[PDB]
Amino acid sequence: SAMASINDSKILSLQNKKNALVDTSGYNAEVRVGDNVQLNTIYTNDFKLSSSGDKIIVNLNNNILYSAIYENSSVSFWIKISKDLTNSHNEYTIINSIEQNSGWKLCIRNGNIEWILQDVNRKYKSLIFDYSESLSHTGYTNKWFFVTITNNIMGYMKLYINGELKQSQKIEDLDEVKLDKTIVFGIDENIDENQMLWIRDFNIFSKELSNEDINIVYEGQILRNVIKDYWGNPLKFDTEYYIINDNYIDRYIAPESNVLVLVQYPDRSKLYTGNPITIKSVSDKNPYSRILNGDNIILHMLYNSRKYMIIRDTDTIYATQECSQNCVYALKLQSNLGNYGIGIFSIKNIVSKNKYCSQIFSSFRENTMLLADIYKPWRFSFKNAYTPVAVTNYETKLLSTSSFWKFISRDPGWVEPP
Numbered sequence: 001s002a003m004a005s006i007n008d009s010k011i012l013s014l015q016n017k018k019n020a021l022v023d024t025s026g027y028n029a030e031v032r033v034g035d036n037v038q039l040n041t042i043y044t045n046d047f048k049l050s051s052s053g054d055k056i057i058v059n060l061n062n063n064i065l066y067s068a069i070y071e072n073s074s075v076s077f078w079i080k081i082s083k084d085l086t087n088s089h090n091e092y093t094i095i096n097s098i099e100q101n102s103g104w105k106l107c108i109r110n111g112n113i114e115w116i117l118q119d120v121n122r123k124y125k126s127l128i129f130d131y132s133e134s135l136s137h138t139g140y141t142n143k144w145f146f147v148t149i150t151n152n153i154m155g156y157m158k159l160y161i162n163g164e165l166k167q168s169q170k171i172e173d174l175d176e177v178k179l180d181k182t183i184v185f186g187i188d189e190n191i192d193e194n195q196m197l198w199i200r201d202f203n204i205f206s207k208e209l210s211n212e213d214i215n216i217v218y219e220g221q222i223l224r225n226v227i228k229d230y231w232g233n234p235l236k237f238d239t240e241y242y243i244i245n246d247n248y249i250d251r252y253i254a255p256e257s258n259v260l261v262l263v264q265y266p267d268r269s270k271l272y273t274g275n276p277i278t279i280k281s282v283s284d285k286n287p288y289s290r291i292l293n294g295d296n297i298i299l300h301m302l303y304n305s306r307k308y309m310i311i312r313d314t315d316t317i318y319a320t321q322e323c324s325q326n327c328v329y330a331l332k333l334q335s336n337l338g339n340y341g342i343g344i345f346s347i348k349n350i351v352s353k354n355k356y357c358s359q360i361f362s363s364f365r366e367n368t369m370l371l372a373d374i375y376k377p378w379r380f381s382f383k384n385a386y387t388p389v390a391v392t393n394y395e396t397k398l399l400s401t402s403s404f405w406k407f408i409s410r411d412p413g414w415v416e417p418p
Helices: 002-008 209-221
Strands: 011-016 019-022 031-033 047-049 058-059 072-083 089-096 102-108 110-117 124-130 143-149 156-163 164-170 181-183 199-204 240-245 252-254 260-264 276-283 298-303 306-312 328-334 344-349 359-364 366-376 385-391 405-408
Touching: 002 011, 002 199, 019 031, 058 124, 072 209, 089 199, 089 306, 110 143, 124 156, 124 164, 143 209, 156 276, 199 209, 240 252, 306 385, 328 366, 359 405
Parallel strands: none
Antiparallel strands: 011 019, 011 199, 031 058, 047 199, 058 181, 072 143, 072 199, 089 102, 089 181, 102 110, 110 124, 143 156, 156 164, 240 276, 240 405, 252 260, 260 328, 260 385, 276 298, 298 306, 298 344, 306 328, 328 385, 344 359, 359 366, 366 385
């Protein structure tokens, strides 16, 4: 099978075992983790480079007969780069195997990540990807994204992002590139507070992975059944989120006359605007545990310093009385907290390479899916509102962006002043 072929080719795999980051490929690289480097804070095999001088040094135990590279190879990992590091016009070297002349290195510079392969003469080839897109919400500033480098020493070096090919450069025309002996993770440039990044699931393979192979690794490491927050972190219970609809990214959820509506951000550049919603486990899973596909959840909104439970309206938005076809329900708040079916929802990941988003469903009385669009949701006013609603008969809306929700947590990689 493709997968066996894949995993079998692993010649370095940095994973957390017994609370230490080590090489689990079988090849016994020495992995020296700096004393202040925090491991396993978001995902099991992650590490955070955040304090001055944070470093991980890996010393390979590899071929001693070939001084020069003799086989194809690939490198994969996920990376998440803070807003403050992204906003710098400076250049930062993040991973480096160049000891004297040859080797490769990963750099960040003005919202771009650049991969460099260099030979013994310092002739080099470069692959670049603009992950920031000038801090756009569509881009990947402070967002987990899968990077993959494949090398055909007698062909091309390719750069993939989330399994999509971005850039190719011939490397067959380089002269000698020596086998790596040491790989250094860490920034040596002077950094400011809040300039941090995370790396997870670092692997090197002894072959040039096909695009098909790469998508298999990508899908396997994304953890398909773990719901994600906006940044690509696992979504957690008991954690504050600013919840936004994909069709109205600069509007926040707010109660107006006890009907939830979407109010426009006064400043589109400030993500953390609105009324934080905390997600509660109905089955009583551990505090702060990860939320998964199929979990029953309850939503609590913090509004003007008080907590309320978000519930579906018992009646439909317009009067024709008991509805059982094409029904639309507004959402409301109640101060009585407890397990009420009318307030129980379930969240399901949407498969997308460019957004971390989910659909939210209710099965109370009638099966509904939450979406946002323009409605007249008040019983005593004809006023329109961008309104989050629970709608029945939603089969034709399953691919509609109006049904996609994102959960923005206050993340250390995106800092906003009080």
